[PDB]
Design a protein around this ligand. Structure first.
Ligand SMILES: Nc1ncnc2c1ncn2[C@@H]1O[C@H](COP(=O)(O)OP(=O)(O)O)[C@@H](O)[C@H]1O
Ligand SMILES: Nc1ncnc2c1ncn2[C@@H]1O[C@H](COP(=O)(O)OP(=O)(O)O)[C@@H](O)[C@H]1O
Ligand SMILES: [Mg+2]
Ligand SMILES: [Mg+2]
Lengths: 30, 279, 348, 441, 41, 380, 31, 104
């Protein structure tokens, strides 16, 4: 359970980073 | 395929390997290493090894064929000069010492308390002392108290007398002093017990001979290593003397030898404790 | 991963020094265990960049020069170049504002703004000798300069350049100065220069000779036939009168900065500086403590503060009292008299 | 006056905001992603304020302007500014942009602005016509993205009928629209329509109908946390009325956990009221902190008095608080539950006795619970044991109530089951987070 | 995303108060005195 | 060091007068009246008269008002003289004197505004600290929570910029007093134990009163090892407790597991605590926490004990110990359960693994709720 | 005596500019 | 001085003898220990409770029948403590991510 929680938190952080990156690219395009 | 590639990467650093000396890092995944064969090679580095363990002197293990750096050996730090090992402890305890309460308290405050209870020193913010000197009549327990400190220390004890420094081939005395201090710095925390020091610590009077110049050079190197441009930190220096009327005031500086403990002749009280302890 | 593996299986390349270029297509190199080799040069590597004594890399097959590589430095000399700068600060030096400005006129003004000296028509000062009684802040000032230098601060002790071997001290001085020039601008700090630097002796078995040889090599290096550019030497030593008047001359050392024992206001400044982290109790007048220390060294003031803290520690408290400070002063000011009135009464 | 100039400044920044929103709607239309629509309706409540008559007039005269019947429908419903000096022609659509008919997203959003502004002006009849026209227009449209927008206006439609106090002339329409969304497999629209229908049912007290639907219909998990919270609150009310008290407590706790942090004071207050009532019905004393919150202090103060009265066991205090503040419960829609608790107080005392003691005799239980006879104590403790509130058994041979001895749970399979639920949730979270990853082309 | 459909409708102490604080009872000194004199005889 | 204005003894006497059983007391009235007439405190006299419905003495009130008026005129004259002839230091000192007199004569809002104006004109960091300490003392005197919090934050910030150890120790004492005032007993015990050896804020209270507060709060906050190391073996604490046999007995009875004497001393401590102006609202909470602490300490060493054994140890009856135990278990404070048929309390202390599993479940549930909320927020 | 004051950046700019600059910059760049 | 130090010595001797006679048994009664060490039952019980409370020799007294059980104090299961620390650490990480994700 601890390892699964670690992995889920890591995946959530990665998804947040990816959303931030794609929004940064979209806003920097203009 | 990625798992297979990782397996091959591990297979690279496989027996047999050739020990060399990591001479100098050049850039990422590239360095110069001096092999034990007797030649220096410009080689690559595996990404697996951390770039922080590659000290410019630490030994490394290289692939036999391509000589590429593939591993770092554990530090082979040994007795070197003295480096009292856990089997070389003097086996003398504070219980074995009979009645040196004031001296015991001062030495424990100087070289035992800072290495364990440093939070108190930080709370007062006083930079606990780095050097103590025990002075008194010979055969009063200075060396034995140093032995007891060695037995009951968590640091790396180093013992050396002020006679091993004075050697022929001028420039080996100061070299020995700086080697001892560098070894103490490497094996931090450390305690250096400089034994009988009247030989080389004498007043730096005007020198006119090679021997006088070299002994004053030894004293100067001691002063520079104890408190110089390179702050050692986490090491302690302990010195012994019979008179304390001699010795350069630079050595007796509060910056270098902060504490000066006196080991007088035992009296009717100390003598009773010594008799009870020995008998 | 596959690229790393493929690069790994490539044979390790020899490393060899360079004597001189020979053809614009061949280089005379010298490998470690064998002798000289006249070798080809890689297509990317340019001949006008492989200078003599540059420690190139040669392929293991045809000894082809494929990389230029960093220059060789004697391992022992490289340890003299500071990487992790110390923690001393100009704000931690008390009572030496004039000394600090005087040394910075040579260590900061020329390197930062050489145009001022060029327009004035004067030559930039080179050598600063910090001389005075021990424990007054010479190497402390050197540490403070090293903290704020934005420049190479190669450090040398007074005994690292001695060696047991003939000509090795001079060679190491030469390599130190060549490294300083290659990393110019640079500042060289030579602490405790009494060891090498003392008054030159004559011949005879009494003379140290080799130390004098290292002396002469250093003297020429910092001021000789070849003029140093953007290299400044800071030299700290007691016993100003025992070092020979050949490095003491103005050309070798332009400024001689004296570090007298701190005056009363300087002692007050040092006490304030070293009691910043100590929890003082109201009624801790430091002026009176400075009175109770009539002509200390400056390191004795730090020892006084440390011993007051030790009394506080032994009493298991965290504050420091005025009586604590006074009796710590008394302990640190321990003076050893003759203790023999017969000797003291010789000189009426 | 400079005040009117500053009003014009904030009006034109609202114009820029709505221009950004319609641009996002068009980007969603041309980008094959509905998340831009969700972001537009997320910014929608922020710009639901800061608007006036001229803001919407300039909006409808900047967009549309295709001489369609839309202009003939929305212009007469709002006032118009005079011949202002700052006749800044606000024309987001130029030529071909104004030539093409407006996308359903943008026209729906602007008509939504009309209806919310009309509601803010508190003349519900005027907004009724515009809402009816809006939903006549969007009924035929089958755009997937519009459903999102449709979802929102769906809610707003029900909202306006709340101020019309009818809530019944549209119940069949909401039923049909929910069915259409269900056959469209929509997530947001189905969830919001279920929530609105449940709210209507509870406003008209048809709890059996709501229970039947929630038994038949399935709430989409992949919905808004706000809609999830509303559905959980309504379901908790249903289960509380249906006597399913434990499930109601769990559902209302989940709804409170999914409340929008500090955004909905009234919804949180109502959820706290109902949760406190149902927890008291279970026999559990609620958290004290609920009553000391800055926003819920006065709202839950009568419930504080109720909880104090029941915990102290003073039924006279219970009747007293019924007399004074109990009528407020009728306004809060909890009076029946409060009466049930009035007649179920003794369960709390039985639970306390079970928690404290382990082998307390029946006579001692009757003495400590003010019960007249030991046989009444036997009946009450047996009923409480059967109803899943106590974990004891009455040795009727000598009349002592022995609680079930506590077994080492870590030596049992319960920790494995709890860890299984936690692991499944963590793996599902990882799968959801990695599943989208939103890598743009 | 405010929930406007549901309308949003001395003792200002900072410390967290537990349920037992509200419970009324005699002072502990009185209870101890009563128990002491009860068990004394 | 710092002046005793405003006197917290005045606040204590006023609170004691406000107490029901001490409302009819005379000695409190005599001492308070003597303090007021020695200080010529007219506005606070009016406030006390209106709060306690007292009969105001017209002659004394008029004399106090006239004295205050002429003194205020004198301070205004000195301020004008300093402004016209002297520098900013003398006008600053005059304004500080005016604010100090305003606080002395019991004016609350006037003292507040005068001290705020002085702080606006104050430049020397030590004098800013002194003014902030004066404001903190006024807030403690009037139990103004917002004023105390704001001035505590201001003093902490000022000390962080520049702070002498003396003022930092005094701020620690003030913070401990406020933490006691807000039932935050753990922080109060921390601060009082840190300042017991170097207590110099005699304006707030005497050393014995501070030590009694320290003993009480450390008893309610510290566990057994910390209480033994820092309080039982405390040097200064034992030295002063040598002159306080009652407090020493109360402290040592719990540590030595003499529970009957501990209960009697706790009743005495509760009676003392009720009359205290600062420990007023928390006396019931303190007593309940001490009873729970004693019960838990006794039950820590036993798996199953007869109710009669606790009745004998605490020197109470079986029924009282049973009622208190049942109430505390029902509140989830003691890890035990009672068998009234055999009248045996059996402890249910979770083992290390069970407690670790329960803590893991709780913390993981909180973290997973946070994770679910975050994910639902970000994944749209 | 009077302590030596520091050399601020404005002073440095003035000393390196308030003087010969008609050919100084050109001469230095040429060298 | 004599009284204080002799009381301290007597307490230490009592503790040492109580530990000495407790190694063999596992559930010995307090009466048998009192007979072995020759004191009153109440004094022995109070001393044993003090040692148990002060984290001395591990065991729990059963006053109901009269017993002092002994066991082997299971270590602490370092895995669970480190798991709790990791749960706290990623609670902090989740707060940090809450600080992020404000950029939409
Ligand atoms: N206080 C003491 N208790 C017991 N033995 C002592 C004590 N002082 C000295 N001795 C004995 O005298 C010897 C002193 O040796 P050493 O420490 O070398 O003397 P010093 O250091 O003064 O030259 C030790 O071997 C020890 O056995
Ligand atoms: N002016 C000063 N202000 C503060 N500390 C000083 C000062 N002068 C000397 N010290 C103290 O002296 C110590 C080192 O002295 P050092 O520089 O070694 O003297 P020297 O160079 O003469 O041997 C340092 O720890 C430093 O704190
Ligand atoms: Mg010896
Ligand atoms: Mg020095």
């Amino acid at each position: 359970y601890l390892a699964s929680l670690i992995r889920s938190v890591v995946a959530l952080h990665n998804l947040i980073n990816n959303k931030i990156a794609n929004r940064d690219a979209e806003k920097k395009e203009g | 395929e990625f798992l297979h590639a990782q397996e091959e990467v591990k297979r690279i650093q496989s027996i047999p390997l050739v020990i060399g000396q990591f001479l100098e890092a050049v850039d990422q995944n590239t360095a110069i290493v001096g092999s034990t064969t007797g030649s220096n090679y410009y080689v690559r580095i595996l990404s697996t090894i951390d770039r922080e363990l590659l000290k410019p002197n630490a030994s490394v293990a290289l692939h036999k064929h391509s000589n590429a750096l593939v591993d770092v050996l554990p530090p082979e730090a040994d007795s070197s000069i003295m480096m009292l090992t856990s089997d070389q402890k003097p086996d003398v305890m504070y219980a074995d010492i009979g009645g040196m309460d004031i001296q015991k308290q001062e030495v424990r405050e100087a070289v035992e308390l800072p290495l364990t209870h440093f939070e108190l020193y930080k709370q007062i913010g006083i930079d606990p002392p780095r050097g103590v000197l025990m002075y008194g009549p010979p055969g009063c327990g200075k060396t034995m108290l140093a032995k007891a400190v060695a037995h009951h220390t968590t640091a790396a004890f180093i013992r050396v007398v002020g006679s091993e420094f004075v050697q022929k081939y001028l420039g080996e005395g100061p070299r020995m002093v700086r080697d001892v201090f560098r070894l103490a710095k490497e094996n931090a925390p450390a305690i250096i017990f400089i034994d009988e020091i009247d030989a080389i610590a004498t007043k730096r009077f005007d020198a006119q001979t090679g021997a006088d110049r070299e002994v004053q050079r030894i004293l100067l190197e001691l002063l520079n290593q104890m408190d110089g441009f390179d702050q050692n930190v986490n090491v302690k220096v302990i010195m012994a003397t019979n008179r304390a009327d001699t010795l350069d005031p630079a050595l007796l500086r509060p910056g270098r030898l902060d504490r000066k403990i006196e080991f007088p002749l035992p009296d009717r009280r100390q003598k009773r404790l010594i008799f009870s302890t020995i008998t | 991963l596959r690229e790393e593996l493929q690069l790994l299986q490539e044979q390790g390349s020899y490393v060899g020094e360079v004597v001189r270029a020979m053809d614009k297509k061949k280089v005379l190199v010298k490998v470690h265990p064998e002798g000289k080799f006249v070798v080809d040069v890689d297509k990317n590597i340019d001949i006008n960049d492989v200078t003599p004594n540059c420690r190139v890399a040669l392929r293991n097959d045809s000894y082809t020069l494929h990389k230029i590589l960093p220059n060789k430095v004697d391992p022992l000399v490289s340890l003299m170049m500071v990487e992790k700068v110390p923690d001393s600060t100009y704000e931690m030096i008390g009572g030496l504002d004039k000394q600090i400005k005087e040394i910075k006129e040579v260590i900061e003004l020329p390197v930062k703004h050489p145009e001022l000296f060029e327009a004035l028509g004067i030559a930039q000062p080179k050598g600063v000798l910090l001389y005075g009684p021990p424990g007054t802040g010479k190497t402390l000032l050197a540490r403070a300069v090293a903290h704020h230098t934005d420049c190479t601060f190669i450090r040398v002790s007074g005994s690292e350049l001695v060696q047991k071997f003939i000509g090795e001290g001079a060679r190491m001085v030469r390599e130190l100065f060549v490294m300083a020039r290659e990393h110019a601008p640079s500042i060289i700090f030579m602490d405790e220069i009494d060891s090498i630097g003392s008054s030159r002796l004559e011949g005879g078995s009494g003379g140290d000779s080799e130390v004098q040889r290292t002396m002469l090599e250093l003297l020429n290096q910092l001021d000789g036939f070849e003029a140093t550019k953007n290299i400044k030497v800071i030299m700290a030593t007691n016993r100003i009168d025992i070092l020979d008047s050949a490095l003491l001359r103005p050309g070798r050392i332009d400024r001689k900065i004296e570090f007298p024992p701190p005056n009363e206001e300087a002692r007050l400044d040092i006490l304030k500086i070293h009691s910043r982290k100590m929890n003082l109790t109201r009624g801790i007048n430091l002026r009176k403590i400075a009175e109770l220390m009539p002509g200390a060294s400056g390191a004795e003031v730090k020892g006084v503060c440390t011993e007051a803290g030790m009394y506080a520690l032994r009493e298991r408290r965290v504050h420091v009292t005025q009586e604590d400070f006074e009796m710590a002063v008394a302990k640190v000011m321990q003076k050893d008299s003759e203790k023999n009135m017969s000797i003291k009464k010789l000189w009426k | 006056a400079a005040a009117e100039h500053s009003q014009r400044e904030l009006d034109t920044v609202t114009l820029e905001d709505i221009k950004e929103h319609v641009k996002q709607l068009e980007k969603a239309v041309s980008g094959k992603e509905p998340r831009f629509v969700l972001r537009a309706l997320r910014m929608l409540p922020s710009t639901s304020r800061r608007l006036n008559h001229y803001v919407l007039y300039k909006a409808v005269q900047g967009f549309f302007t295709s001489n369609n019947a839309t202009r003939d429908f929305l212009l007469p419903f709002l006032e118009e500014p005079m011949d202002t000096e700052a006749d800044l022609q606000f024309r987001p659509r130029t030529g071909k942009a104004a030539s093409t008919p407006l996308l359903p997203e943008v026209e729906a959003y602007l008509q939504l602005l009309v209806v919310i502004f009309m509601m803010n002006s508190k003349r519900y009849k005027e907004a009724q016509k515009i809402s009816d026209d809006l939903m006549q227009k969007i009924s035929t449209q089958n755009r997937r993205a519009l459903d999102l927008v449709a979802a929102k206006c769906y809610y707003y439609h029900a909202r306006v009928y709340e101020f019309l106090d009818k809530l019944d002339v549209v119940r069949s329409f909401l039923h049909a629209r929910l069915r259409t969304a269900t056959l469209r497999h929509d997530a947001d629209g189905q969830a919001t329509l279920l929530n609105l229908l449940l709210r209507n049912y509870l406003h008209y007290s048809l709890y059996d109908q709501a229970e039947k639907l929630v038994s038949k219909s399935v709430f989409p998990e992949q919905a808004n946390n706000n809609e999830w919270a509303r559905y959980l609150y309504y379901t908790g009310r249903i289960k509380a009325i249906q006597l399913e008290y434990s499930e109601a407590r769990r559902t209302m706790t989940n709804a409170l956990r999914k409340a929008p942090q500090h955004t909905a004071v009234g919804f949180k207050q109502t959820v706290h009221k109902l949760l406190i009532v149902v927890e008291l019905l279970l026999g559990e004393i609620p958290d004290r902190l609920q009553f000391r919150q800055p926003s819920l202090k006065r709202s839950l103060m009568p419930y504080f008095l109720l909880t104090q009265a029941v915990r102290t066991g003073n039924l006279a205090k219970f009747n007293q608080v019924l007399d004074q503040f109990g009528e407020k419960f009728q306004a809060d829609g909890t009076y029946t539950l409060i009466i049930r608790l009035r007649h179920n107080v003794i369960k709390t005392g039985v639970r306390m006795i079970s928690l404290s003691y382990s082998r307390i005799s029946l006579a001692d239980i009757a003495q400590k619970l003010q019960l007249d006879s030991p046989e009444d104590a036997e009946f009450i403790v047996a009923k409480a044991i059967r109803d899943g509130v106590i974990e004891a058994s009455i040795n009727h041979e000598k009349g002592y109530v022995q609680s079930k001895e506590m077994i080492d749970i870590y030596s049992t399979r319960e920790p494995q089951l709890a860890f299984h639920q936690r692991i499944s949730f963590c793996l599902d979270i990882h799968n959801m987070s990695v599943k989208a990853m939103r890598f743009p082309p | 995303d405010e929930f406007e459909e549901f309308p949003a409708e001395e003792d200002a102490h900072v410390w967290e108060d537990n349920w037992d604080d509200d419970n009324v009872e005699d002072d502990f000194s009185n209870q101890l005195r009563a128990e002491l004199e009860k068990h004394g005889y | 060091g710092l002046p005793k204005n405003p006197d917290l003894r005045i606040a204590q006497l006023r609170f004691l007068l406000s107490l029901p059983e001490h409302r009819g007391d005379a000695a409190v009235r005599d001492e308070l009246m003597a303090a007021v007439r020695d200080n010529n405190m007219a506005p606070y006299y009016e406030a006390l008269c209106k709060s306690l419905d007292w009969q105001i003495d017209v002659d004394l009130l008029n004399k106090m008002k006239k004295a205050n008026e002429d003194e205020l005129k004198r301070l205004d004259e000195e301020l004008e003289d300093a402004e016209k002839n002297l520098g900013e230091s003398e006008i600053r000192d005059a304004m500080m004197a005016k604010a100090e007199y305003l606080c002395r004569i019991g004016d609350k809002e006037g003292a507040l505004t005068a001290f705020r104006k002085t702080y606006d004109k104050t430049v020397a960091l030590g004098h800013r600290l002194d003014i902030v300490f004066y404001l903190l003392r006024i807030g403690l005197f009037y139990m103004d929570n917002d004023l105390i919090t704001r001035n505590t934050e201001k003093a902490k910030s000022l000390i962080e910029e520049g702070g002498d150890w003396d003022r930092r120790n005094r701020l620690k004492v003030y913070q401990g007093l406020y933490c006691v005032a807000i039932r935050d007993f753990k922080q109060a015990a921390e601060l009082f134990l840190d300042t017991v050896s170097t207590f110099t804020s005699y304006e707030l209270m005497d050393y014995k009163t501070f030590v009694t507060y320290t003993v009480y709060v450390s008893m309610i906050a510290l566990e057994r090892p910390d209480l033994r190391e820092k309080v039982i073996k405390g040097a200064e604490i034992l030295e002063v407790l040598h002159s306080l046999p009652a407090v020493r007995q109360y402290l040592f009875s719990l540590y030595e597991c003499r529970y009957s004497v501990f209960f009697q001393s706790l009743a005495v401590v509760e009676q003392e605590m009720k009359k205290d102006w600062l420990f007023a609202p928390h006396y019931r909470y303190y007593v309940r926490e001490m009873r729970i602490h004693a019960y838990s300490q006794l039950l820590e060493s036993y798996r199953s004990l007869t109710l009669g054994y606790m009745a004998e140890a605490f020197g109470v009856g079986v029924e009282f110990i049973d009622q208190e135990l049942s109430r505390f278990i029902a509140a989830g404070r003691l890890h035990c359960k009672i068998d009234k048929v055999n009248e045996i309390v059996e402890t249910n202390r979770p083992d290390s693994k069970n407690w670790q599993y329960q803590e893991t479940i709780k913390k993981g549930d909180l973290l997973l709720n946070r994770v679910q909320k975050l994910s639902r927020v970000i994944n749209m | 005596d009077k302590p030596i004051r520091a050399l601020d950046e404005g002073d440095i700019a003035l000393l390196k500019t308030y003087g010969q600059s008609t050919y100084s910059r050109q001469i230095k760049q040429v060298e | 001085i004599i009284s204080t130090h002799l009381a301290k010595l007597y307490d230490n001797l009592l503790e040492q003898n109580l530990i000495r006679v407790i190694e063999p048994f596992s559930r010995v009664q307090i009466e048998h220990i009192s007979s072995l060490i020759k004191l009153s039952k109440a004094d022995v019980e109070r001393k044993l409770s003090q040692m148990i409370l002060d984290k001395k020799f591990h065991g729990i007294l059963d006053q109901g029948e009269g017993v002092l059980i002994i066991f082997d104090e299971p270590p602490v299961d370092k895995t669970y403590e480190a798991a709790l620390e990791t749960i706290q650490n990623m609670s902090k990480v989740v707060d940090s991510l809450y600080n992020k994700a404000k950029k939409l």
